[PDB]
Amino acid sequence: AQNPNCNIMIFHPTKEEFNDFDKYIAYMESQGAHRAGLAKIIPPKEWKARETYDNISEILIATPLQQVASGRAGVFTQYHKKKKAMTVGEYRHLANSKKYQTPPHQNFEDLERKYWKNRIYNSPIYGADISGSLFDENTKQWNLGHLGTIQDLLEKECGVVIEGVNTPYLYFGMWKTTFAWHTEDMDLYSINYLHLGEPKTWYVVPPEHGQRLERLARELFPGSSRGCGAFLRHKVALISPTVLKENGIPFNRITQEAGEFMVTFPYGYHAGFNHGFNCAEAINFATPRWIDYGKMASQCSCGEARVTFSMDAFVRILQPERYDLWKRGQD
Ligand SMILES: O=C(O)CNC(=O)C(=O)O
Ligand SMILES: [Mg+2]
Ligand code: NI
Numbered sequence: 668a669q670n671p672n673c674n675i676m677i678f679h680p681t682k683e684e685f686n687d688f689d690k691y692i693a694y695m696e697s698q699g700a701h702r703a704g705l706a707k708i709i710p711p712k713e714w715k716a717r718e719t720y721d722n723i724s725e726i727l728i729a730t731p732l733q734q735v736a737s738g739r740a741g742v743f744t745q746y747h748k749k750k751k752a753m754t755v756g757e758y759r760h761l762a763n764s765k766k767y768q769t770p771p772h773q774n775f776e777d778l779e780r781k782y783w784k785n786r787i788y789n790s791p792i793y794g795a796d797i798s799g800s801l802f803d804e805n806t807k808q809w810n811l812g813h814l815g816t817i818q819d820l821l822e823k824e825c826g827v828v829i830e831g832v833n834t835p836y837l838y839f840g841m842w843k844t845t846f847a848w849h850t851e852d853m854d855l856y857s858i859n860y861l862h863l864g865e866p867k868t869w870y871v872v873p874p875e876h877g878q879r880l881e882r883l884a885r886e887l888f889p890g891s892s893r894g895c896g897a898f899l900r901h902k903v904a905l906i907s908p909t910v911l912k913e914n915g916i917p918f919n920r921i922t923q924e925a926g927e928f929m930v931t932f933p934y935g936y937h938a939g940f941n942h943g944f945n946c947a948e949a950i951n952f953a954t955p956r957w958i959d960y961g962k963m964a965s966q967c968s969c970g971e972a973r974v975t976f977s978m979d980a981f982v983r984i985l986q987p988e989r990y991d992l993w994k995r996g997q998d
């Protein structure tokens with residue numbers, strides 16, 4: 668069995684190997700990469716996403732989100748308070764202001780220590796989930812707006828044609844902006860490219876051990892767990908590496924830098940934080956190996972999770988017994 672300890676693997680594809688996206692995902696899996704829940708892919712030196720980032724300031728962040736924490740430093744939830752619209756140039760200036768800028772630090776480990784000690788005492792503002800892309804149309808390799816669609820994969824594997832679309836999303840971050848513990852919608856893969864700026868630190872639980880994280884979360888967030896049998900789908904709960912280690916939860920960590928891709932694998936729980944002003948692009952995708960995960964994915968039906976249009980068909984076809992309850996939660 669490849670990668671039996673479920674370590675995060677880092678790949679360096681050649682320019683030739685960077686041509687065929689699906690084939691390379693399957694290669695990484697042949698080496699056991701998926702066992703970790705997360706892999707890093709460093710693009711060949713010949714590749715670029717676009718020519719420059721000098722002209723992005725006029726992008727609008729219609730609904731910046733202030734991420735307000737409640738709890739204790741290592742075990743907390745966050746809620747998202749909506750703020751007035753601002754441009755990426757305005758948001759960049761805000762991120763670099765004295766109130767929001769990254770503190771002085773020695774190295775990534777020192778900054779991680781400071782994040783977990785102090786996160787809850789601040790409310791950073793995140794430009795998340797903005798439909799759009801920063802890949803040049805002429806970038807042919809690993810262009811996240813030109814991937815095969817999940818609807819097409821489902822149709823190829825199972826024969827059923829479905830409605831829906833699959834487009835990328837931009838994320839503008841600042842110091843302490845946080846992504847809560849989650850798997851993807853329908854336990855899909857995700858791919859995330861860090862276009863520019865400061866790093867992103869990731870934590871991940873191997874898919875084979877995801878239920879250990881779920882059981883801890885039910886213990887640590889007992890009101891939330893009574894409210895909803897899949898409350899991690901709400902994407903609000905944080906648990907620190909120290910708390911995970913105290914509770915024996917298997918996990919790994921890695922820091923992504925600008926110019927690097929990360930892939931999350933089906934049912935790989937992940938969480939993390941941004942080091943300073945940055946911009947990432949991410950999208951969900953599927954492979955044949957996903958279908959069994961999609962059929963077994965938990966679902967939130969309490970009303971909180973609310974998701975895209977395109978998840979309807981995935982539930983309807985892969986999980987017909989659950990469909991009527993889930994759709995009520997959507998309505
Ligand atoms: O970068 C972020 O805030 C969160 N991204 C992801 O959870 C992802 O790419 O799957
Ligand atoms: Mg612009
Ligand atoms: Ni994710």
Ligand SMILES: [Zn+2]
Nearest residue numbers: 895967969971
């Ligand atoms: Zn719920």
